Amino acid sequence: MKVFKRVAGIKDKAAIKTLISAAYRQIFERDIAPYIAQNEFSGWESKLGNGEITVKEFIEGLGYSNLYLKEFYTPYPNTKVIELGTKHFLGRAPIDQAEIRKYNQILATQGIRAFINALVNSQEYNEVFGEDTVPYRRFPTLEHHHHHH
Template sequence: MAIPLLDYSPTSQNQRVTGFEVFGDEQPRVYSTDNLLSATDMDNLIEAAYRQIFFHAFAADREKYLESQLRSGQITVRDFIRGLLLSNTYKRSFYDLNSNYRYVEQTVQRVLGRDIYNQREKIAWSIVVATKGSKGFIDDLLNSEEYLEAFGYDTVPYQRRRVLPGRSEGELPFNIKSPRYDDYYRGKLGFPQVIWQTTVRTYVPQDKQPKAGNPALFLDMARGIGPKVNPPQRIAASNIDYMTSVPYRRK
């Protein structure tokens, strides 16, 4: 028998602050199937979903079958997000390399678009992971009232209200605030690594690099040539016999 979700009290965060939304460059762009006008818009929506869940998806990490179903209208955006969360890439990158607490924190950030309220919420969802597994935890998040009210079935999750009007700086993005690996696994994998370089590397733009026939290409070769010449004679002026050295006409 699964233990019901423990009660936790929400704290005041940006996404719970109501107010007039002033859109700008730092405001998240909302991707939804309600306003798709072309195939390019669908491509952008899929890329936004990958960025939200994986932060970056390599060619081997892409779920081609789910993409095909989403393009043909067989599944909703919510189903596509569920497929990414249950994929081997997400399991290998987040579930296998983190504790339940950290796995809950990173998944809530990506799915609900907000930070964990407090330690009690982290413990409550960790119990769900322990009793229902990762699949049951993800299903409970996607079926929660908060997710359906914020994103519904057709909108890609995003970090909600990261920037508030009147503040000089907004909240840090989740991928910067919560890196993929915790301290234990970062030490186990041997990073971050500090590499000291003894030589200073320089970069020359392509338009400033010498072309074929430029004398600068032969400068090193010219410097490498060491011609052997006879050294000049060093004779003091007092030792020169001017009378015999200067030619003159003999009678």
């Protein structure tokens, strides 16, 4: 039940970097070594800790990192990048085969930066995991809304 989000008062670079380490294990899936994280994102981390950027813009920027894409995109088929990508941001599986075709089409035409940006600008993300909250896995529960047809 360890909930990682930005509290209005966290100016601490240590607590910020723990929020960032959690965001790695959400998006990149792997636990990233802090000495690697300061070689890759030490310049991007300073904006989050001092407050020049939001948590949404930081995390969307982690989704743009070619380290993540080297692992879960460049050796992976585009459709598998959709389900694992949405799992890491929305915490959901893709809705229909047509939903898959749209994320697949955006990634094919624009590219990977537009694909992550589509998952993060999905209305479910901003209303639940907004510009303060980290996208944690949404429990094995998930079952809502399903009424009598």
